[PDB]
Design a protein around this ligand. Structure first.
Ligand SMILES: Nc1ncnc2c1ncn2[C@@H]1O[C@H](COP(=O)(O)OP(=O)(O)NP(=O)(O)O)[C@@H](O)[C@H]1O
Ligand SMILES: C[C@@H](C(=O)Nc1cc(Cl)cc(-c2ncc[nH]2)c1)N(C)C(=O)c1cccnc1C(=O)O
Ligand SMILES: [Mn+2]
Ligand SMILES: [Mn+2]
Ligand SMILES: [Zn+2]
Length: 353
């Protein structure tokens, strides 16, 4: 009942949703219209993604994610240095070429410059652009000093997914082989997040994103097509993800003056959650009346990922989110220590008083 009380606190206010939805749509639709007036971005379209649109945003509707997608015909990908997730793109767009290479940094720079200029002309609403966030492919706005919106430029390809995904998306026993085939016929996206190059970055490179598929999975998440559509099939999958997100969010807030938790994000618990869904494919393994055990399942799986330093990207199995190339052993051991403490003491970080 403690966890149910936490979930109640984490629910979004209907009034907050109403106000935030109206503000975000108005700003983003406006910016989409304006971007379409530039010769480079004339074909851009909108794709809403991330936790708000997955219905697993917690506490307040104060952070939205949207892709501004662009279909570039005759796209040719080249994997960057066996990184599995990062690619060169080979091809109004000549302004972004460096050779035959379509430079991710050049496109993102112009994207940001246009948005910056357009929000300066917005006089009816309080809209500012936040300082660049290291390693982010997004341009981030703050509306009314309270609502953050991450706008990510994304190249769209309707080609077959890259070979690094061949063994990913292992949903056959959970969501079915038919659905896996259907999802892999959808487009994929490249976002301007650059591969590491020594102490710097390979500024021409793009990164694969399957944020849209993650949304498809979370909003059609049951083995039963009617999971969570009736009183007899309410599962606790989304509640477990919300609780894992809150656990990480609260620990990051508490330990914010440490650096050890700075490299963890909600995508780590999202990825681990998808793996637990693969391991537990039946809706009967996610019964509402088993919330406590299901959440403990999720926590101990995440702990094992930290201990083994293994957290495969759900779509790209050879991309290890917990590689020591990305996160120090010391940082993973530190997070392990804090989560173990929370588990062993019935999650005091969840308590308001
Ligand atoms: N490390 C990553 N690798 C791949 N995709 C990522 C990564 N981080 C974020 N994304 C994608 O970008 C989306 C938006 O990121 P973010 O706003 O951090 O997460 P979120 O899922 O919306 N959770 P939150 O906003 O904390 O409630 C995620 O849902 C992912 O699809
Ligand atoms: C680490 C970094 C990052 O790598 N994000 C990322 C990586 C990839 Cl590969 C794809 C996409 C994507 N695909 C579609 C839309 N966005 C995003 N990050 C998590 C953020 O900057 C961040 C921080 C706080 C809140 N929100 C975000 C955010 O990203 O929304
Ligand atoms: Mn988000
Ligand atoms: Mn975001
Ligand atoms: Zn369900």
């Amino acid at each position: 009942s403690k966890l149910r009380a936490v979930l109640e606190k984490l629910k979004l206010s209907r009034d907050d949703i109403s106000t935030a939805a109206g503000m975000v749509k108005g700003v983003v639709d406006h910016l989409l219209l304006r971007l379409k007036c530039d010769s480079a971005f004339r074909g851009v379209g909108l794709l809403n993604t991330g936790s708000y649109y997955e219905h697993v945003k917690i506490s307040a509707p104060n952070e939205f994610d949207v892709m501004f997608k662009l279909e570039v015909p005759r796209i040719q990908l080249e994997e960057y240095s066996n990184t599995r997730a990062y690619y060169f793109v080979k091809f109004p767009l000549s302004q972004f070429l460096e050779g035959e290479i379509l430079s991710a940094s050049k496109m993102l720079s112009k994207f940001r410059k246009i948005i910056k200029e357009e929000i300066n002309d917005i006089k009816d609403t309080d809209v500012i652009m936040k300082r660049k966030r290291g390693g982010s492919p997004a341009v981030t706005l703050l509306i009314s000093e309270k609502i953050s919106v991450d706008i990510t430029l994304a190249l769209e390809s309707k080609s077959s997914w890259p070979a690094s995904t061949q063994e990913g998306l292992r949903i056959q026993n959970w969501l079915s082989a038919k659905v896996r085939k259907q999802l892999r016929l959808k487009p994929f996206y490249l976002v301007p997040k650059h591969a590491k190059e020594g102490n710097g970055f390979q500024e021409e490179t793009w990164r694969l994103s399957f944020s849209h598929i993650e949304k498809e999975i979370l909003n059609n998440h049951g083995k039963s097509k009617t999971c969570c559509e009736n009183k007899e099939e309410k599962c606790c999958r989304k509640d477990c993800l919300k609780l894992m997100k809150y656990l990480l969010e609260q620990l990051k807030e508490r330990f914010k003056d440490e650096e050890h938790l700075d490299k963890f994000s909600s995508y780590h618990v999202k990825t681990a959650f998808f793996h637990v869904c693969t391991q537990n494919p039946q809706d009967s393994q996610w019964d509402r009346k088993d919330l406590g055990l299901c959440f403990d399942n999720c926590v101990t799986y995440f702990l094992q990922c930290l201990r083994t330093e293994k957290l495969e990207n759900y779509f790209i199995p050879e991309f290890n989110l917990f590689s020591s190339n990305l996160i120090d052993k010391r940082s993973k051991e530190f997070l392990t220590k804090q989560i173990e403490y929370e588990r062993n003491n019935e999650f005091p970080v969840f308590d308001e008083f």
